[PDB]
RNA sequence: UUGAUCAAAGUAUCACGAGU
RNA sequence: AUGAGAGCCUUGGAGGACUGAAGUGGAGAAGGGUUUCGUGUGAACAGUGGUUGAUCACGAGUUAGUCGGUCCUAAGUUCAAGGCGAAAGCGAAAAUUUUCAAGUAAAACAUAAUUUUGAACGAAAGGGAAUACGGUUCCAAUUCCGUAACCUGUUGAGUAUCCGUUUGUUAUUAAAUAUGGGCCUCGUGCUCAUCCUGGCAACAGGAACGACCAUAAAGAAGCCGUCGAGAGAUAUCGGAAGAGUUUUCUUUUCUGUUUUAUAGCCGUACUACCAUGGAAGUCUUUCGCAGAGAGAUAUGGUAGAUGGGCUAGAAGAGCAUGACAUAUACUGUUGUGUCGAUAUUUUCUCCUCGGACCUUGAAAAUUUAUGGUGGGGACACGCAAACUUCUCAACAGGCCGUACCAAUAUCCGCAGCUGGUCUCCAAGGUGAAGAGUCUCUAGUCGAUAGAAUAAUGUAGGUAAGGGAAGUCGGCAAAUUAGAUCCGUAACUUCGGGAUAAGGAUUGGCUCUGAAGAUUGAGAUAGUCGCGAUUAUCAAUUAACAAUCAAUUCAGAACUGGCACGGACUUGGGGAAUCCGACU
RNA sequence: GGAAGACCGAAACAGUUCUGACGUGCAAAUCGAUUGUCAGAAUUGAGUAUAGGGGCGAAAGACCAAUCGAACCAUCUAGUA
């Protein structure tokens, strides 16, 4: 069968791993734009639905009132939510401001 | 990779005579299989929504399917929606009754 | 090729069965004037078209 | 082999007809496949207890050709 | 913010065609393919197909009308003109 | 007021019968 | 090796480099017409040779019901005789041409309201009966065998359909798709009759009334960007099996793990329906806007599953990876086929909505169901029957087109000529990427040769100073080129000019900071015997507690030709004129 | 949020300056550097119309088979000087 010549991927599993500690992407290799390296219409897609995936658990676990989404959806249709971190204190504060008021 | 795929029927150009897919084999060889046009359903006509209860098909192979697969029990069965006909029965029913009292 | 028709399959035998050389004894007739053929076809020095 | 049939009596009822000229059986380590080549169709019983062969093999129409591979 | 400063929806067609021809399609495409209160379906679901041929997208009533607005002010005037006149002939 | 209607009923006198 | 004789081609052994998957690679169209293949070879033929050739000599070689021409019709040929022309014939929407009706199981007494152009060609790219899988020859395969389905037509066999009652059976029951009814002595008598049953519905079921007339769809789409799933192509992780290398080191880099059509059963992505219900403190929902008293969220259901997933297909199928054993031979036999995950338009697919638009996106052959007055079935003690749209068996399916090149050697280029030629599949890395550089996979060395460092030329360059003086003229040619961070002038129709200019910054190596998913975690009291067993929910909890996860960022130490996008990809700029607006 | 006859760019095509490479070629128009558009007035395989004093022409008398201010092929044609 003329036994084949090796085409070794050995060096490839040292670049797609040294990225996991980022050994190669500073400035000197980013030849594309940062825009279409990781596009907005997928970056903004990942964050926005993930907060919804926290929302529907928080819609119907019991922990947030039914009327507290259609003012918090406009904010999630707005901007002011970077992380899933900042969402929860702006519940824990605002679920407390509804608590002690009652 | 694979060792790539020709066409096997005569026609080459990517046309609507042959949309096509790739499945495998028991050899690992993946000849380039093609499928038919897409099967879908009749309509309600009035409401113009692709109706409910009726199998996808073409009209080509349709007569070798059984009666239940063709339509349903009511009148105008795959000819009308039940949204259609509930609007369609009563519409004259008062009017023909109105045609009684107007005939007096 | 490959989508011919039933003239151009039968026409193409006659412009094939005429592509032998001379019969390989008939230069011993009387008055032999036949050295090698008049109609003799190669296929890049001669075309068909008729 | 486009059909399977799990019932046993109809697996003998469909045996005696104009078709079903042969029966192909096969002894897996797992189970036993019952292939009976009919004219249009083909019928399949799956049996896996490794003991209900003999009582359901004979149980046969006597003139039937058996294709025995094991 | 106030994204452009004047032009609005013709801003696709910029730096072209002239001053008061960039404006004349503004005044005739802020009306077209905006949504209208349907006279029958009640909602606001009116987009175009071609010249003067509107349909709804809800309850499937389709009505022929004006060609850059839903129906012109030329049109209902006629719909008012034949209205008052119709009671005069037979009565 | 986005259904729909075709393919004689009625009537009259004869056939006013045949079979029976 | 062989050959009378070889830089080739002619091989086969190595092994150097190219073609780089928008190939010099595998197969399709037009055109070629015997080139494809073996066997044999002397001379012209192969702008050099020649032991092989697209030359001759000499032999073989193209199998089909399913691939396809065949039917349908498209722009249009003007192609019945109304017409005109001296005739041929007519750079012709021949719409007038006794009936110029196809006719239609039809009825007297032009079968009745009905049919306008009578006819045909026109698409191996559009429409369109139905199939694929494994091996197989000197060259052929959705064709040949092996095996496994279907369609169309024909024929045949079974196939709702036997009643109250009582033949089976005391009756309750049972053949009987569900018998009742008044009467009568019960009824035995009498009478009454089945052209299918289910669900509140959407619709469901194995089949259950078309012969015509009638609507209604499909048949029937353009093009753009799209979230959802899936297919296969790949990539990392782990068991396996056998191959790779070894001074040195490497639990390591490799091949390979598969399951087709047609079927049955589970059968959610996912929009739209049905029942309920009556929402404002408006609410639900996406990447968007879409939605709602013309019924929104809910509670359950309906139907489409294209999709998957197990079982039929599955002889350790076959195949493949290797085992052993057999001079060996169409042999023999052993073993394997096990799991997760992660992503992509370096591709197609069903589905979902929105988008430009004085751009609205073909016809018809064939086809379903429904409507329809008639008419034909049509007894209840049964015998059944059913172009039955059910199950299932026999039965044929004619006609020809198939080999090969499919273009730096089969085309046309007077020629084996860098030249124009329709599309199809399309990999590793870097990376924005189908770039451009590079290898695996396939395939090629084919361009006359060994030699030799003259000019001039042919193309690829650098050259100390100054830098347009040069020349018609800044034209060949050089700097700039990627991305992030600012920083942006006059004139503007206020959309620009905008990459303005004018700048800084950019390795390798060692790290922290951030952007997610599934189980949330889960007190409390006892039981059995810590094992086993039984529960409420606040705080939790911001990268909780377990667990897996893409890859792009946001910084910082330390260090090196002091070169940093290191080659490739790739811009010089600025005030003015005069044009012409622009693409 | 992705619209515009919007931009830099690749196979698709075009053909600008070098007036560079052969100008008895690779060729009765091509090669090599350079440059423009590149999601529409776009690019295109097949089918069909259009006819020699006319077809067609986003207009140059371009193009009509290597011919175009009138082809192309036989004649009256040994046409006249």
Curated annotation (Swiss-Prot), chain A:
<keyword id="KW-0687">Ribonucleoprotein</keyword>
<dbReference type="GO" id="GO:0003723">
    <property type="term" value="F:RNA binding"/>
</dbReference>
<protein>
    <recommendedName>
        <fullName>Large ribosomal subunit protein eL19</fullName>
    </recommendedName>
</protein>
<dbReference type="GO" id="GO:0003735">
    <property type="term" value="F:structural constituent of ribosome"/>
</dbReference>
<dbReference type="GO" id="GO:0022626">
    <property type="term" value="C:cytosolic ribosome"/>
</dbReference>
<dbReference type="GO" id="GO:0002181">
    <property type="term" value="P:cytoplasmic translation"/>
</dbReference>
<dbReference type="GO" id="GO:0022625">
    <property type="term" value="C:cytosolic large ribosomal subunit"/>
</dbReference>
<comment type="similarity">
    <text>Belongs to the eukaryotic ribosomal protein eL19 family.</text>
</comment>
<keyword id="KW-0689">Ribosomal protein</keyword>
From Swiss-Prot, chain C:
<keyword id="KW-0687">Ribonucleoprotein</keyword>
<comment type="similarity">
    <text>Belongs to the eukaryotic ribosomal protein eL39 family.</text>
</comment>
<dbReference type="GO" id="GO:0002181">
    <property type="term" value="P:cytoplasmic translation"/>
</dbReference>
<dbReference type="InterPro" id="IPR020083">
    <property type="entry name" value="Ribosomal_eL39_CS"/>
</dbReference>
<dbReference type="GO" id="GO:0022625">
    <property type="term" value="C:cytosolic large ribosomal subunit"/>
</dbReference>
<dbReference type="InterPro" id="IPR023626">
    <property type="entry name" value="Ribosomal_eL39_dom_sf"/>
</dbReference>
<protein>
    <recommendedName>
        <fullName>Large ribosomal subunit protein eL39</fullName>
    </recommendedName>
</protein>
<dbReference type="Pfam" id="PF00832">
    <property type="entry name" value="Ribosomal_L39"/>
</dbReference>
<dbReference type="InterPro" id="IPR000077">
    <property type="entry name" value="Ribosomal_eL39"/>
</dbReference>
<dbReference type="GO" id="GO:0003735">
    <property type="term" value="F:structural constituent of ribosome"/>
</dbReference>
<keyword id="KW-0689">Ribosomal protein</keyword>
From Swiss-Prot, chain D:
<keyword id="KW-0689">Ribosomal protein</keyword>
<dbReference type="Pfam" id="PF01781">
    <property type="entry name" value="Ribosomal_L38e"/>
</dbReference>
<protein>
    <recommendedName>
        <fullName>Large ribosomal subunit protein eL38</fullName>
    </recommendedName>
</protein>
<keyword id="KW-0687">Ribonucleoprotein</keyword>
<dbReference type="GO" id="GO:0002181">
    <property type="term" value="P:cytoplasmic translation"/>
</dbReference>
<dbReference type="GO" id="GO:0022625">
    <property type="term" value="C:cytosolic large ribosomal subunit"/>
</dbReference>
<dbReference type="GO" id="GO:0003735">
    <property type="term" value="F:structural constituent of ribosome"/>
</dbReference>
<dbReference type="GO" id="GO:0022618">
    <property type="term" value="P:protein-RNA complex assembly"/>
</dbReference>
<dbReference type="InterPro" id="IPR038464">
    <property type="entry name" value="Ribosomal_eL38_sf"/>
</dbReference>
<dbReference type="GO" id="GO:0022626">
    <property type="term" value="C:cytosolic ribosome"/>
</dbReference>
<comment type="similarity">
    <text>Belongs to the eukaryotic ribosomal protein eL38 family.</text>
</comment>
<dbReference type="InterPro" id="IPR002675">
    <property type="entry name" value="Ribosomal_eL38"/>
</dbReference>
UniProtKB/Swiss-Prot annotation, chain E:
<keyword id="KW-0862">Zinc</keyword>
<protein>
    <recommendedName>
        <fullName>Large ribosomal subunit protein eL43</fullName>
    </recommendedName>
</protein>
<dbReference type="InterPro" id="IPR011331">
    <property type="entry name" value="Ribosomal_eL37/eL43"/>
</dbReference>
<keyword id="KW-0863">Zinc-finger</keyword>
<dbReference type="InterPro" id="IPR011332">
    <property type="entry name" value="Ribosomal_zn-bd"/>
</dbReference>
<dbReference type="GO" id="GO:0022625">
    <property type="term" value="C:cytosolic large ribosomal subunit"/>
</dbReference>
<dbReference type="GO" id="GO:0008270">
    <property type="term" value="F:zinc ion binding"/>
</dbReference>
<dbReference type="InterPro" id="IPR050522">
    <property type="entry name" value="Ribosomal_protein_eL43"/>
</dbReference>
<keyword id="KW-0689">Ribosomal protein</keyword>
<keyword id="KW-0687">Ribonucleoprotein</keyword>
<dbReference type="GO" id="GO:0022626">
    <property type="term" value="C:cytosolic ribosome"/>
</dbReference>
<dbReference type="InterPro" id="IPR002674">
    <property type="entry name" value="Ribosomal_eL43"/>
</dbReference>
């Amino acid at each position: 069968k003329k036994p084949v010549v090796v085409h070794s991927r050995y060096r490839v599993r040292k670049n797609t791993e040294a990225r996991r500690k980022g050994r190669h992407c500073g400035f000197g290799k980013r030849k594309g734009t940062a825009n279409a390296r990781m596009p907005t219409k997928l970056l903004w897609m990942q964050r926005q639905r993930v907060l919804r995936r926290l929302l529907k658990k928080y819609r119907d676990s019991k922990k947030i009132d039914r009327h507290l989404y259609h003012d918090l959806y406009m904010k999630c249709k707005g901007n002011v939510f970077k992380n899933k971190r900042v969402l929860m204190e702006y519940i824990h504060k605002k679920k407390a401001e509804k608590q002690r008021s009652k | 990779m694979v060792q790539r795929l020709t066409l096997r029927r005569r026609l080459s150009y990517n046309t609507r005579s042959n949309k096509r897919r790739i499945v495998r084999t028991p050899g690992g060889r993946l000849v380039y299989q093609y499928v038919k046009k897409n099967p879908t359903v009749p309509r309600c006509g009035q409401c113009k929504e692709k109706l409910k209860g009726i199998t996808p098909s073409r009209p080509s192979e349709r007569p070798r399917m059984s009666k239940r697969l063709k339509t349903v029990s009511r009148t105008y069965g795959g000819v009308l929606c039940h949204s259609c006909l509930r609007e369609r029965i009563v519409r004259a029913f008062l009017i023909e009754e109105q045609k009684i009292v107007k005939a007096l | 090729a490959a989508h011919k028709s039933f003239r151009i399959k039968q026409k193409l035998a006659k412009k094939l069965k005429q592509n032998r050389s001379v019969p390989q004894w008939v230069r011993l007739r009387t008055g032999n004037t036949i050295r090698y053929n008049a109609k003799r076809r190669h296929w890049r020095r001669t075309k068909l078209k008729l | 082999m486009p059909r399977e049939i799990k019932e046993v009596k109809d697996f003998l009822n469909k045996a005696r007809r104009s078709d079903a000229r042969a029966v192909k059986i096969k002894k897996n380590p797992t189970n036993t496949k019952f292939k009976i080549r009919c004219s249009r169709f083909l019928y399949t019983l799956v049996v896996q207890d490794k003991e209900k062969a003999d009582k359901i093999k004979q149980s046969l129409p006597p003139g039937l050709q058996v294709k025995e591979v094991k | 913010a106030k994204r452009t400063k004047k032009v609005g929806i013709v801003g696709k067609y910029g730096t072209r065609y002239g001053a008061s021809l960039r404006k004349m399609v503004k005044k005739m495409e802020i009306t077209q393919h905006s949504k209208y209160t349907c006279s029958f379906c009640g909602k606001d679901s009116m987009k175009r197909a071609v010249v003067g041929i509107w349909s709804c997208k809800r309850c499937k009533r389709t009505v022929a009308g004006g060609a850059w607005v839903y129906s012109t002010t030329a049109a209902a005037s006629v719909r008012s003109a034949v209205r008052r006149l119709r009671e005069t002939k037979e009565q």
